[PDB]
Design a protein around this ligand. Structure first.
Ligand SMILES: [Zn+2]
Ligand SMILES: [Zn+2]
Ligand SMILES: [Zn+2]
Ligand SMILES: [Zn+2]
Ligand SMILES: [Zn+2]
Ligand SMILES: [Zn+2]
Ligand SMILES: [Zn+2]
Ligand SMILES: [Zn+2]
Lengths: 372, 372, 372, 372
């Protein structure tokens, strides 16, 4: 498996797994990594929805950042200043839960620009991304104010770009030859959308969560890589969540897209490669779901799980697994100093500061040796 | 290792590893489970700070619920109805970022009561826990309002019991034989605290985070299990983060509790069992840290890592590892069918519901089999 | 998922995963664990062929013991003395490579009786199991003679029971109500067999390796669990091993059991549950293999991987995953240590023993402590 | 951690973890990878002893290849043809058990030269390496003869280079500027040795198994990297193995090198870097072991676990962890395909070949698509 090794001290070429940080991206390539593929129920094996998209022009995007995903994203050895741009298909906790962790973690880890978030309005102010993000920041104001005492705060801001959820395949981002468009989904209530990213001839479709709708088939047409929700079977709804037969049946018809519906939709879309996700990918779930999709779609397919990666070039769409460090550490980028802000009041009172215990004796040993 | 196996078809007794869900609790026993031991920087091997405490009387508590920790908590096979009470030492994202995830995932998973959260206050309203949780609930307002359309809102509420962060060893909860007391910490700004849980003649202390202070050695005195921050060394600060010397030296004296200070602190407390946590536990960091500690403390000592477990009994404090499923699933409890509040208006508009794709034909085949 | 949890302090019942050591086996139940499911090529995710069978009368067998399987087998927390009987289907390294590690490690793990091994003859003496095992013992002469000086050597014998490979469904074992029959396979050269195991109404078939043959369909009919080889596709052969199309094609017609053949065979067998094994079980191989099998067979099917477990009952064959410890240990049994025979030659010379380093000093301190 | 990333589309330099196959080895550099560090008891976390050594001139060696190590070795993505040279410290199963798996597996994976094995003599013929490997090949004669029908048999040979175990730091290998030397150990009986590899001013010492002895401290002196056995504590011996107090005490005195002894030894040796191995490396064992060593040794130290890697250069010896695929595959090297031999009698008799099942019908669908 992999490319043929040509030399003893050389590098293994065309490696059968993706090792994050070890492969150059070419000018006419896209790399998409599934950093979370699962549910609102947590599990170590699948974080919640998150995709990282790296373009050969050097731009990098996050689409969705669900609870748990930060640990996958941080294992990619991408410096935090390259991952400042985040798109949210909707405001379920399992699609934006780890935004806080990107915001706060990315900032101790040396981001120097503000985060930029694109996401959808709702049917009124208090159901859209602008309201959501603004209150999150208040939610974590203790965290914000104490951190800002010691680190310039400009990177701790979040610039939100709220776009109209109702719009039909309209542009919501356009920069440096890259376009994002959105269109709506039908999912729990008004707000959710799907994105399409266009760049240098490629189209990548990030479906989000949805019951089957008429817009995705139209606007995802011809994607190089098309991602869509694909639910666990009604038989698995009974075994796993002990649901009555009637409610089990409805889930795969009213509330969610079934594997059979996914098959029809990808049959319509005709992409170079489809990707089913948002189901628990276990040894006793995955096969029936595959078979349901194959009822109606015959083309290249990926059954998504965490750390799956696609390389999109002219000639091919290649699925591999990424093998990344469990004991991850932040990795530094080329960015430099921002001089801390002198105009920040301490959030300590003298009362607390008087509580300090004397520990000079116990530390004098290591403290002495270290000062060489 | 473990108890002598005596039967061919029986059950291995007193197992060398803890299998969650497999052992009964007994009326004089406490079980403490580290569900996160890490840093604000995320990592598959270490979720951020979380602790689960199950008591002999059937009571359960989460102390801290940092980002990523839910996946570990979920692998315990404890029904969502039994973990409704959560205690926060401080408002840093790595000590309550997964609250939203408990709140949202638990509610979907049939939790029937509201979550209950105790946390400190700050030097003013916008720096304390009641303000944080209030704005957290607004942050996830879309999620709340849409889920509340098909599920009774009562489990979606969160009752916040704020307490004065300045109080010295005062009682903050008192129920069913169980007491918690708080005292202050010295950590980034006013607000952060430690807890001591007292029950049935047991005392268990949760340090949260702090620089060494005079309050912990006093009020933690003779704990069965005492938990305190223990930071990485200054040589490791220079190697892992590329800190210059002066700054690395100070991280361990002014901002954080060094291993040498932790030992001193535990030499004072004289507990049954001491736990160091809040450092990246790796094959190249851990040993120098345990050796800084032993300089000043020689009692029993745990170097915590995720899914480590302590059994408190009269005879001993026993450390084991937990071996849980990575492919976790929610596990049902006793609690009943609490019905939808049918007055709740839908959150869809007709403009969205109007885009449903027709998928009758595609689903006809499996619809028919499942019905018959 | 799993069974309804009924008390805070008690035990979760009918658990969705099998924790080895934590469940009783009932007088009318079979438990089959896959301890290896892989190939002649090694891999942490899949050891080579090995099967553990625990019967409700308290009998235990290993059918095959391929290279790498001991780590999985030793995670079952089964005492070494319960695992003395071993059936080999054939003599490829991936089916008996770990015999020696059972022999040696098991002996130090406690085993007190001889290992006992059943396996087939070949077309001449030097192609059979007696020759094989006897020469393996000579290969490890040094380890055996040196270990025997210190102990009674009885547990280091291996008694081999060779049976004719040509025989059609004849009994090779019959003890305590358990029967085993064998019949032939077509696989590399004369000698490999498949086993049927019968006890208390149940029938479990261990197919081993084989190109498709007339004996399996006949003698495997009506098995509770039928295990058979099921190969990787010809596309995957060209993709992963760079086979030119012609050779890739015949790999699936001449030499191995194709997925479609597997389906045809299990079609004729009509087991309660069929098991496919012996392929690399990766996110990018298993779907085309499953689909191959479903062309021709629609009864219950398992796609094996390591640590899969089947519980067999009158009412059901249930598939679970086992969750067992990676940091496994020797677990002590009832078996009691027997008296040696003061009559074996030492294997040291004095030239060697006169090289001992004087370490008295460096060991004095911890010595002093330990004599408490 | 790691080098600073300089570009969006570029490769992370000096990565904080080692991804096998991804790094060029410099002309004046050695890379040593621990592919097993455990015991004769099997465990997923710790294969039995195995070291892979890669030199900057393109030469590679395996020192020990114990049970279970092959899965780790195979994850390194080195073509079988580059790892034909194997050095055995001694003839315990946990040091050469997986030799049969290198032999068979690498042959079916396009190794085209014979394996070359160096190992010690014993006090008489039947306690040496030559005898041992001769009988290992006979033990697996069914596998050997059936394979040589279809694959050229040359690479199925093992040339054994036996050397005198008694020799005191004498060359046993010399080639292309690379020297291995051996000296005796005291372990179980006469035969075991330790090795030193010398090349290009570097010295790496592979301890093997031994009670403390006068030879290692003298001949390992000034090693760039030195490896020695470091046994579990006597207390851990009573907890984990239930050894009575006196038995547990002599184990660390007469039979093994205690951690305190390790430390004295390394204090004499003064290696640029020391490495302890051959203990179960667990959260509840490692710490006291490390404390043991530091009683007497203060220099750089690693506590070996599986997939740890050392880079040795002129400036530094760096420890890192290797992160490699669990789902491993053979990778092909540059070599010339070896044509078989037709003068090889089949190992099939017609009696078995007459048993083939016809499967043209079940296979006709996929057959047709695949041929076009
Ligand atoms: Zn959603
Ligand atoms: Zn979702
Ligand atoms: Zn904090
Ligand atoms: Zn913290
Ligand atoms: Zn075979
Ligand atoms: Zn095989
Ligand atoms: Zn040995
Ligand atoms: Zn050994």
């Amino acid at each position: 498996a992999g490319g043929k090794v040509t030399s003893s001290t050389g590098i293994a070429p065309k490696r059968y797994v993706y090792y994050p940080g070890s492969e150059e991206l070419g000018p006419d390539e896209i790399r998409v990594i599934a950093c979370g593929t699962g549910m609102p129920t947590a599990r170590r094996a699948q974080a919640a929805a998150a995709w990282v998209v790296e373009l050969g022009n050097g731009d990098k995007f996050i689409v969705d950042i669900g609870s748990g995903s930060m640990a996958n994203i941080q294992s990619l050895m991408i410096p935090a200043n390259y991952l400042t741009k985040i798109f949210l298909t909707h405001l379920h906790t399992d699609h934006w839960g780890d935004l806080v962790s990107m915001w706060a973690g990315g900032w101790t880890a040396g981001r120097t620009d503000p985060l930029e978030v694109w996401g959808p309005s709702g049917s009124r102010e208090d159901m859209g991304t602008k309201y959501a993000v603004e209150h999150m920041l208040k939610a974590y104001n203790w965290d914000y104010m104490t951190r800002a005492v010691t680190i310039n705060p400009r990177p701790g801001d979040i610039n939100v770009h709220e776009f109209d959820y109702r719009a039909l395949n309209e542009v919501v981002y356009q920069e440096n030859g890259v376009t994002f468009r959105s269109w709506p989904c039908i999912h729990a209530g008004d707000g959710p959308v799907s994105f399409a990213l266009e760049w240098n001839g490629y189209k990548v479709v990030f479906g989000g969560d949805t019951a089957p709708n008429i817009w995705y088939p139209e606007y995802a047409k011809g994607a190089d890589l098309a991602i869509h929700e694909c639910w666990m079977t009604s038989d698995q709804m009974m075994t796993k969540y002990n649901q009555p037969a009637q409610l089990a049946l409805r889930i795969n018809l009213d509330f969610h897209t079934s594997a059979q519906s996914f098959g029809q939709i990808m049959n319509m879309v005709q992409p170079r490669h489809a990707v089913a996700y948002h189901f628990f990918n276990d040894d006793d779930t995955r096969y029936d779901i595959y078979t349901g999709v194959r009822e109606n779609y015959a083309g290249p397919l990926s059954m998504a799980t965490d750390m799956m990666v696609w390389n999109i070039t002219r000639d091919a769409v290649t699925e591999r697994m990424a093998v990344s460090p469990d004991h991850a550490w932040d990795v530094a980028g080329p960015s430099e100093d921002l001089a801390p802000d002198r105009n920040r009041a301490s959030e300590y009172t003298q009362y607390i500061l008087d509580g300090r215990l004397n520990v000079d004796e116990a530390n004098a040993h290591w403290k002495q040796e270290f000062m060489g």
